[PDB]
């Protein structure tokens, strides 16, 4: 590798071929794995020179080398990305999207993905410079399979970064412009394209219900459910995130997920060996049991109540916390018959065992659930049977001890339970 001093000497030479050789040397330096000297290159003042080289249409090699060098600077910290933006790189890269050389257009796609991925402000600035139309034009072919794999993967990833980040979410008109192409990519047979398409959809459904509706109206829920069942963990993870986001919306949006058959995948998801999959599947279940009584009934019909008993009994604690929410939501909105069924499946003992958790929030959630189950027992006149159940498995000990607990909501609801049923 060259030294930064020699790269500077070559780039300042006013000899195009000397500049090309030095820019290639900079590219190779910035491509090394262990601590590339990004800050040294920035401090040397080379970014504006690299940006000017992006416009040298007669010398496509120096366009490519400078695009690659700038890509790897913009891959770093926000301050390093800002240095690239401050050098004028955004409109220069957008102009390169139209290059007749595929490897150069691809490098501009990559660089814009790094810039837009930095945060909402740079994302929106890339959009304001007009990046979306030429990016989408590169995908305006009747069959995506005619494009090179790596080219298509890079385009999908950059589009996904234009969809990500919040405060603010991406402009509504930009999302509307991107979504039809994103839906095509979501049906494309390549695992990396599918993964990044799912991530993009997961970003667009992470927000207010109006944003969820824009996505659900494009008809993607059945494809998301298909990808929910994929064998590749990098696909299941964003597919599950998107499905989980969608069921945080309206009852009607939640129903599209149920109608598409998503619940049939959850015996596997709720026992998945990856902790984060179990956690986010249980989170998704908790928002489905926050739904209508007919939606709770679909959870019952799919045999998922025993699986909720399972995760409550034994899982990572964060998963158990989501399971507690699923139970409290279920008992808050369920019929008496649905709550009777939950007790019959064995919920009481794992519920009580979690009252030993040194976590104030899960205790409040569990005490709420117990209260909800007692209210169902009152309508059946069987609160005595439930009190014996709670005592037999060691639950009265822990409720009683929770009267002497610090947090106010805890001992309040705790004392209430004992006065009225014990």
């Amino acid at each position: 590798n060259w030294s930064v001093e020699d790269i500077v000497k070559g780039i300042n030479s006013n000899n195009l071929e000397s500049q090309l050789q030095a820019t290639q040397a900079a590219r190779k330096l910035l491509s090394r794995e262990k601590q590339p000297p990004i800050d040294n290159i920035i401090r040397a003042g080379l970014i504006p020179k690299f940006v000017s080289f992006l416009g040298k249409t007669d010398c496509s090699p120096i366009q490519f080398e400078s695009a690659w060098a700038l890509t790897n600077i913009a891959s770093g910290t926000s301050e390093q990305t800002k240095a690239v933006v401050d050098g004028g790189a955004i409109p220069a890269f957008i102009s390169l999207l139209a290059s007749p050389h595929a490897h150069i257009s691809e490098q501009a796609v990559w660089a814009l993905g790094n810039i837009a991925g930095d945060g909402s402000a740079f994302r929106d600035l890339v959009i304001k410079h007009g990046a979306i139309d030429p990016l989408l034009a590169l995908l305006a072919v009747p069959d995506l399979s005619t494009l090179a794999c790596g080219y298509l993967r890079n385009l999908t990833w950059t589009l996904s970064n234009l969809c990500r980040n919040k405060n603010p979410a991406p402009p509504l008109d930009a999302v509307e412009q991107i979504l039809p192409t994103l839906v095509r990519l979501l049906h494309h047979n390549d695992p990396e394209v599918l993964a990044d398409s799912c991530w993009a959809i997961s970003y667009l459904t992470d927000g207010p219900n109006e944003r969820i509706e824009m996505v659900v109206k494009k008809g993607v829920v059945p494809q998301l459910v298909k990808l929910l069942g994929a064998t590749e963990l990098p696909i299941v993870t964003p597919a599950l995130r998107a499905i989980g986001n969608i069921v945080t919306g309206t009852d009607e949006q939640t129903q599209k997920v149920i109608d598409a058959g998503a619940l049939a995948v959850f015996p596997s998801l709720l026992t998945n060996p990856k902790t984060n999959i179990q956690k986010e599947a249980t989170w998704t279940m908790s928002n489905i049991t926050a739904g209508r009584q007919d939606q709770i009934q679909q959870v019952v019909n799919h045999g998922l109540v025993p699986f909720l008993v399972g995760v409550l009994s034994k899982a990572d604690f964060k998963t158990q916390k989501e399971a507690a929410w699923a139970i409290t939501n279920y008992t808050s909105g369920g019929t008496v018959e649905q709550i009777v069924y939950l007790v019959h499946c064995g919920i009481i003992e794992p519920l009580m065992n979690l009252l030993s958790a040194k976590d104030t929030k899960i205790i409040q959630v569990i005490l709420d659930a117990i209260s909800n189950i007692f209210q169902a027992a009152e309508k059946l006149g069987e609160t005595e049977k439930l009190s014996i159940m709670i005592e037999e498995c060691g639950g009265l000990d822990k409720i009683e001890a929770l009267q002497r607990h610090e947090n106010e909501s805890v001992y309040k609801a705790s004392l209430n339970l004992i006065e009225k049923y014990f």
């Binding site: 491509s31 991925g117 990500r164 995130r241 989170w283």
Partner: peptide, 13 residues
């Protein structure tokens, strides 16, 4: 009942 709502850069080697 409560609904509960919830790299980005690549180096070219």
């Amino acid at each position: 009942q409560r609904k509960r709502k919830m790299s980005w850069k690549r180096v070219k080697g």
